Amino acid sequence: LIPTVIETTERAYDIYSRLLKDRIIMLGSQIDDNVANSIVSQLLFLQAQDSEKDIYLYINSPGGSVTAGFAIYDTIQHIKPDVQTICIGMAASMGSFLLAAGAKGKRFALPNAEVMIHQPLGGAQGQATEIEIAANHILKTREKLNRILSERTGQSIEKIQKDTDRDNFLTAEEAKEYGLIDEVMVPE
Amino acid sequence: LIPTVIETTERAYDIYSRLLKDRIIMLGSQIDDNVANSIVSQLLFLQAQDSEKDIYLYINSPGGSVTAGFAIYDTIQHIKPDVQTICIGMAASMGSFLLAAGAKGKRFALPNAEVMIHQPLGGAQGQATEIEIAANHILKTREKLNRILSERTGQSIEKIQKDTDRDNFLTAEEAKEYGLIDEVMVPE
Amino acid sequence: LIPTVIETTERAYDIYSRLLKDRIIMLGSQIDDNVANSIVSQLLFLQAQDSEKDIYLYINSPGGSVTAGFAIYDTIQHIKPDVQTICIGMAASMGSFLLAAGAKGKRFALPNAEVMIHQPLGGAQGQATEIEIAANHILKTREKLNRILSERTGQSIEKIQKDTDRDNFLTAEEAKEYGLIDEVMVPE
Amino acid sequence: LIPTVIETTERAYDIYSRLLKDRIIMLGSQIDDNVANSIVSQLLFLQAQDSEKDIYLYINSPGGSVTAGFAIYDTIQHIKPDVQTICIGMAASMGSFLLAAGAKGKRFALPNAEVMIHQPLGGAQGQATEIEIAANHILKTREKLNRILSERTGQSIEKIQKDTDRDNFLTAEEAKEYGLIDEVMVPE
Amino acid sequence: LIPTVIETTERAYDIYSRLLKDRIIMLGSQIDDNVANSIVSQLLFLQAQDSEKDIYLYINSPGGSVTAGFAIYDTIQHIKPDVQTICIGMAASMGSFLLAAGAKGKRFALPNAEVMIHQPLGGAQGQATEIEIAANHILKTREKLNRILSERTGQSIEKIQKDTDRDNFLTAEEAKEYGLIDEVMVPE
Amino acid sequence: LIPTVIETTERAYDIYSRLLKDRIIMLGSQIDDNVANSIVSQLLFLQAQDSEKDIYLYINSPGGSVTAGFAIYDTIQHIKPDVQTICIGMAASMGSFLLAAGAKGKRFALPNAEVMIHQPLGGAQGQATEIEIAANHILKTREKLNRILSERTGQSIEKIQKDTDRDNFLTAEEAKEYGLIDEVMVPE
Amino acid sequence: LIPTVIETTERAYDIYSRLLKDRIIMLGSQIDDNVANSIVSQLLFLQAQDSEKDIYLYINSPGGSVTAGFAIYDTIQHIKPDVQTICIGMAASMGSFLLAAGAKGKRFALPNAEVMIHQPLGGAQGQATEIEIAANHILKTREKLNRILSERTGQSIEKIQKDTDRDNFLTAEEAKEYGLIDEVMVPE
Amino acid sequence: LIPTVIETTERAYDIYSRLLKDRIIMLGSQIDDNVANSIVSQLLFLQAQDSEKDIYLYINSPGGSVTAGFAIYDTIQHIKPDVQTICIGMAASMGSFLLAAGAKGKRFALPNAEVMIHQPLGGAQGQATEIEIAANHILKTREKLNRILSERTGQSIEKIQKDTDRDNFLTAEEAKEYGLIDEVMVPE
Amino acid sequence: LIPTVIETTERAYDIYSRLLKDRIIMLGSQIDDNVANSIVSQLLFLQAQDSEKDIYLYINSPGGSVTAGFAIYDTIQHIKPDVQTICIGMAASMGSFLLAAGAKGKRFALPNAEVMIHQPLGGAQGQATEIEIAANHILKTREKLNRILSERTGQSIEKIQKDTDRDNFLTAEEAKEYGLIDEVMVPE
Numbered sequence A, B, C, D, E, F, G, H, I: 001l002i003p004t005v006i007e008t009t010e011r012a013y014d015i016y017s018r019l020l021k022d023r024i025i026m027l028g029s030q031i032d033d034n035v036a037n038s039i040v041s042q043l044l045f046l047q048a049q050d051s052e053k054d055i056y057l058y059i060n061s062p063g064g065s066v067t068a069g070f071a072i073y074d075t076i077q078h079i080k081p082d083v084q085t086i087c088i089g090m091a092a093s094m095g096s097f098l099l100a101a102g103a104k105g106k107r108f109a110l111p112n113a114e115v116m117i118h119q120p121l122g123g124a125q126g127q128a129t130e131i132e133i134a135a136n137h138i139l140k141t142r143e144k145l146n147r148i149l150s151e152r153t154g155q156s157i158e159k160i161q162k163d164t165d166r167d168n169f170l171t172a173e174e175a176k177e178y179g180l181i182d183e184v185m186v187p188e
């Protein structure tokens, strides 16, 4: 499942860490607190290595937590390096939020990569105690998500609210037309 | 189950990683997000090692997710190296899609290797909320799969739709006749 | 999930440990006894390495135990180094207590980082035997938490009691206005 | 486990219901909401049958919920009939509360029947959300229990508080001396 | 647990059904769809038996579903008979809603019967698909509950909103002062 | 949970069966094959008892299977008696379909009874084998449901398609305005 | 779920048994050995009651075992009475086999009743030991099913083989056109 | 369970990998996709190391999947090196197929090593959807297995069909007489 | 959860082992046989490294076994080095026994560190066979614990017996006043 790579200078790298040497971060799982903590650590590490060179963030996630996604989001915008974004397989739910969060001019996706811009809700525990706040916290988070998405897609807030309410299935071309990505990555 | 190999120059390789040194990627499991993330990382790694030399992708999968399969597909077509394909045991469901996805002129299969070109459906969660989109997403994905397969097999879209709807069992010779593979790999 | 990093001088670091080399402690999980024991060990370690240089504590926790949180709290205040604090994703329950516990002048949070200053109750086992003490232990702990929070936020004890009783959702700007953090960390 | 009894006038009674015909209620289980609802229904039924004749309540409970116990308590005091009380086996926790709750002059217990006057705490769910109320609700319930017990045992509130805090084991003679029961039921 | 009662005229009644003969409905469990369907059937049955005579509804519920509670509520108001209400043990969450729903002038509670007027939320399934409706459905239901409660308690809507947001613990006297019940049922 | 009722002429009825004697069918559960088989048997039974007198169908269902719902639907329309309909608590998903299916002029609902006219999808097993049919079977069933609903509500097919695609929450007044029910059942 | 019906002459019937008094057999579940044994017992019973009068078999089954289905089939053809057939909800898999097995001229189905004429395979245990027989037993059973179906639908064996291989969804009108049923049962 | 071996030149080998250094592959488990993927990787590795020197394949398997077995089979015949075969303990089901698949003149088995040449059937999932293909796929696979076995044992196809249908237990001498192995490996 | 630390001279340490290099033992879990065996091994190791230099034992345990606690106790007193003690978070049950067991003059605790000096009972298995010994073994162990505690706290045995019978909650100041610790560790 996970192979090893070494070189003469010995030097034990895993396949993901060998890619990290070339400033490539791989994200191929649901966005929980654990993976979010790891992705943030890599982004902070690559900045310390070189603050000028670009970072490559490959995405293949079905979704995850909102608070976990914003941790990755804020880190990407906070650091100096321009974080590139390349969607593969699919970018659904919070994965599409990070897809759009890439550096402007450097948001990519492969031809057969699907996209879905709708976050359903978990994390209902802490809110479920009080009524008035629980309902408003959903609205606040909905306003929080739709505002940030609107700025990056470059579309009106009115259109975002309707699309981000129900389920979606955008292709690479449709995602480019929406403004989520900048270019469909043609072969070679 | 998983043996170790080393050499004098010491240098700990697993059997799969020792094959990766000779640009050989082994795929002998169902295509989920985890293995897809690993296969993509290997394809990106081998390109960085040498963009001209060929890659060998041995396949032995019963199937997997559609979105996971396209992640591997798009990566194979995106990179410069010509990815060879050698089917062993069986190539069913999404495994047969990657079988046909190999570089043109370099798609192989061993004599007693079975082939099956039909993807049943999972991943019904995110779609199950809305009705009109859920049904159409199946049609869109069916049109997505059948179009790409038709191009690589070199057959009409009309024939693909019927064959890829129900179950199939093609031998190495029948798969060659279909256009899925280019040659049956004769002993030695 | 967890990648490796090495360098020539060989030297196997995990991503979290490579950050620990630069005096960065990552906290991206619920605060139980296990993680609390690890965080304390890191704080004691970094003090032994250098008692003058600052420590960076990134927080992304939904909460945890009270006794586990105070173990981290007391350690931060006990050691010489000024422990910086940077909230990412969210800082809820006992996470917000450690958020405010950072060195004065060096308490930060990213723009879209949420904050919640209310600890619900677990650890009901040992108290549940006797009645008079169990109830008073909650009051004592409530007085213990609200007193310490009031000092660091710089607000009255009367206001803290009401806010820390029910659920809350403070943004980076609201948390700064409350006195929990000192500055909202602007990009670059 | 549960036998049947009938008579000529046919008339299917279970052993517990045949005793209910002679105004005898059997209580030989932990006091949950289900049994409490049944005991109250029997007390209300026997009152409707005859409001003057006495009721016999045999007790053999290790304990139960506080709110469930008070439902039986209030019902016993509300109805007209003088509810006799006969402890057998043991009367622990809330069982001893109902033991003392019997009609004055008609509280009994057999020679080898144990008694324990201490309620530990469950039902921590609804209280666990808010801190100040949860602790005070224990004190309120402690004041509620100790006040009512003090009136019926005919001892001071100061003595009750100490005894009802920790575990106890009173024999029939000691329970009579305490004031929980009125007489030890001698053979024949 | 459940005894039998018969009489000469033979005639097999359970203890709950024997009470139903005297127009007494017992409610000593959480208010789900099953018990709600049974309670409604009893209310409709007693109306058919006699539309003029009063019905007695004993309550001992920790809570339940909102939609299940309104089914009992609407049925009580729809039928001709004046449904009396007698709280025992506790009336928490939706139980307190039905407690107040009793006929005006005939709402009772025993001395040590607790009351709690706050419904937390379940039934989050059907709403969780769409965002804008899910949050507003909580507000609509909150407006639905608080409006109806305000009319029956005879207090302002402003006071109800605050009390029904967080947890509560009202005694028989406090519940009478609130307007939830009309009289505390004194012994005999 | 389920009480007994008898009378002198002895005659053991359960509460639901006693209502069935007065031509009242209670439906307070999800519509599966088991309850559907029972409801149909009752409808066929009441027709045999008297084909002229009206039947009363009380509804309190969150939903169920489509094929199970149509079994009840077709039976109601097939038999001679005019089946009245009274919604209580809620009528969601397939429950609202049967709500509208009542005899014309005799479709009722209580004041606080909610309504929801959207069927999500299960029963995906038998369809999941073939692709072209599975998607079209959803469209056929959608056309099947929307056509029948449109006739009974008396609105256009265009409006039904949009409303029955996403989630809904109609009150008694809104359901009356929609045409699902004929009158809101006022007290007494 | 299951109500009771009695009458004066006392006489305890369940709703299904009351229908059995009027020669109506209800089938609303998957066809296993247990229900098959019960259905056969009813068919044999109704013959003994009256061998001339017709029997009414209401069907609402998703499918079941082949051997269990043939037990009901053979019994229907063996007995003298003409067994009517009325499909409700759906008649899938082996249910459609019994649907067509009804007396000629008396095979019915309601307007919105679905039909599916394809049996997938279970009961693989006893066959799985030997290879040559296991495969041929499927062919023998396929020849057994298709031959009998062809006779009753009145179509060719060639057409049956293709339709009964893959999944199907026939409406009442299409099932009538196929020859499975004789008439669509119009309202009243 | 699994020991370590190293040598001076340091060099960490597991016991299985140390044998792989001397071109020995150990197979002591059921033949699933995982072990098949590993065995193939070793065969491909040893060919790359030296295409002329022989490989030693020790077998001790009770059986496994057919498709998994053919993956190992085809690989053995495809590569240049003559793969020796030494049966130990037992070679049942698909293990006996690989036993016979060894290089001609180099098929061995120890004195007390049992042999069984019959594959029962699993992998019934993908076939179970369609009837005509499922049965024929068993026949095709039976023809596939019996044809290949007949060639290597050097016996008629008629004899193989009967023996490979039911269970078998051949000793080392009987297996040699059958043609499965070439020689019984005498001590030293 | 557990990070790595290395240095140039390479040298793989875990965070806990890096602290062990500076004679710091971390105890942040319940005291079972496994952790007790590890703690003893560390104490024996640090003595062998240097018998004169002090050892630092950080405690954060809720409790554990008695026999496991005495194993650590006896080891601390047996070895030459003066084992310092620093309580963090909490020191409950057997943790408080080891808290007091520290070298005289070197027993510490942080400001918000709680303390509880009462061991409840497990390990009831081996004793439960014989009656007279089981009860006396509790008394012997109670005399064993209370005697040793009394010596180190420097208080009477009479006071210890009462306090160590029921539950306790001592703060850092109260624990210092009790004699359990020597000083409250002030910041810096």
Ligand SMILES: CC(C)n1ncc2cc(C(=O)NCc3coc(-c4cccs4)n3)cnc21
Pocket (backbone or CB within 6 Å): A066, A067, A093, A094, A096, A097, A116, A117, A118, A119, A120, A121, A122, A123, A137, A138, A139, A141, A142, A143, A145, A146, A149, A164, A165, E131
């Ligand atoms: C924390 C908890 C309360 N929670 N959890 C999930 C969740 C979702 C929403 C919500 O409004 N989801 C719709 C939505 C907004 O924005 C996007 C997306 C844009 C881009 C990708 S998704 N979808 C609101 N609160 C939510």
Ligand SMILES: CC(C)n1ncc2cc(C(=O)NCc3coc(-c4cccs4)n3)cnc21
Pocket (backbone or CB within 6 Å): B066, B092, B093, B094, B095, B096, B097, B116, B117, B118, B119, B120, B121, B122, B123, B137, B138, B139, B141, B142, B143, B145, B146, B149, B164, B165, F131
């Ligand atoms: C996304 C979800 C709706 N989903 N999930 C599975 C799945 C399958 C199909 C589908 O196209 N099934 C038929 C088909 C096409 O192409 C192939 C194959 C070619 C080659 C191998 S399989 N089979 C369509 N949607 C699917």
Ligand SMILES: CC(C)n1ncc2cc(C(=O)NCc3coc(-c4cccs4)n3)cnc21
Pocket (backbone or CB within 6 Å): C066, C093, C094, C096, C097, C116, C117, C118, C119, C120, C121, C122, C123, C124, C137, C138, C139, C141, C142, C143, C145, C146, C149, C164, C165, D131
């Ligand atoms: C075991 C038992 C003693 N226990 N466990 C948890 C817990 C919590 C409280 C309590 O005071 N909860 C409310 C509160 C105070 O202060 C804060 C917070 C400030 C800052 C973040 S949370 N919330 C009281 N007893 C508790």
Ligand SMILES: CC(C)n1ncc2cc(C(=O)NCc3coc(-c4cccs4)n3)cnc21
Pocket (backbone or CB within 6 Å): C131, D066, D093, D094, D095, D096, D097, D116, D117, D118, D119, D120, D121, D122, D123, D124, D137, D138, D139, D141, D142, D143, D145, D146, D149, D164, D165
């Ligand atoms: C409401 C919930 C938090 N709860 N649940 C149980 C419980 C018990 C007490 C309590 O005071 N327990 C000690 C006690 C007093 O008096 C008796 C008894 C005397 C005689 C019989 S019982 N025991 C306080 N709150 C409790």
Ligand SMILES: CC(C)n1ncc2cc(C(=O)NCc3coc(-c4cccs4)n3)cnc21
Pocket (backbone or CB within 6 Å): A131, E066, E093, E094, E095, E096, E097, E116, E117, E118, E119, E120, E121, E122, E123, E124, E137, E138, E139, E141, E142, E143, E145, E146, E149, E164, E165
């Ligand atoms: C429909 C679903 C989302 N749901 N489920 C429960 C629930 C509760 C509320 C709510 O308003 N809860 C607070 C409240 C108001 O009024 C009362 C009560 C007073 C008296 C008795 S209860 N509690 C809102 N939506 C809810």
Ligand SMILES: CC(C)n1ncc2cc(C(=O)NCc3coc(-c4cccs4)n3)cnc21
Pocket (backbone or CB within 6 Å): B131, F066, F093, F094, F095, F096, F097, F116, F117, F118, F119, F120, F121, F122, F123, F124, F137, F138, F139, F141, F142, F143, F145, F146, F149, F164, F165
């Ligand atoms: C057969 C299987 C695939 N299946 N299962 C459920 C299901 C639902 C639909 C569908 O059209 N759902 C939306 C809808 C239309 O009309 C109503 C309703 C109005 C009123 C009550 S329900 N909802 C289509 N296929 C479905």
Ligand SMILES: CC(C)n1ncc2cc(C(=O)NCc3coc(-c4cccs4)n3)cnc21
Pocket (backbone or CB within 6 Å): G066, G093, G094, G095, G096, G097, G116, G117, G118, G119, G120, G121, G122, G123, G124, G137, G138, G139, G141, G142, G143, G145, G146, G149, G164, G165, H131
């Ligand atoms: C004995 C065991 C191996 N088994 N179990 C199920 C089963 C099904 C078949 C088969 O032929 N299935 C397809 C088929 C033919 O005809 C119908 C039907 C028409 C109408 C109703 S069913 N479906 C063959 N063997 C089967």
Ligand SMILES: CC(C)n1ncc2cc(C(=O)NCc3coc(-c4cccs4)n3)cnc21
Pocket (backbone or CB within 6 Å): G131, H066, H093, H094, H095, H096, H097, H116, H117, H118, H119, H120, H121, H122, H123, H124, H137, H138, H139, H141, H142, H143, H145, H146, H149, H164, H165
């Ligand atoms: C594809 C799936 C349906 N499947 N799975 C197992 C399996 C087995 C057979 C079969 O022919 N089994 C008998 C047999 C023939 O030859 C040998 C052997 C000789 C020697 C070793 S095995 N056994 C046919 N289909 C099978």
Ligand SMILES: CC(C)n1ncc2cc(C(=O)NCc3coc(-c4cccs4)n3)cnc21
Pocket (backbone or CB within 6 Å): I066, I093, I094, I095, I096, I097, I116, I117, I118, I119, I120, I121, I122, I123, I124, I137, I138, I139, I141, I142, I143, I145, I146, I149, I164, I165
């Ligand atoms: C051997 C087995 C039956 N067992 N297991 C636990 C246990 C506890 C005791 C006992 O005496 N518990 C009370 C106590 C005394 O002293 C302390 C403590 C002071 C300080 C720390 S603990 N608690 C007696 N036997 C026990």
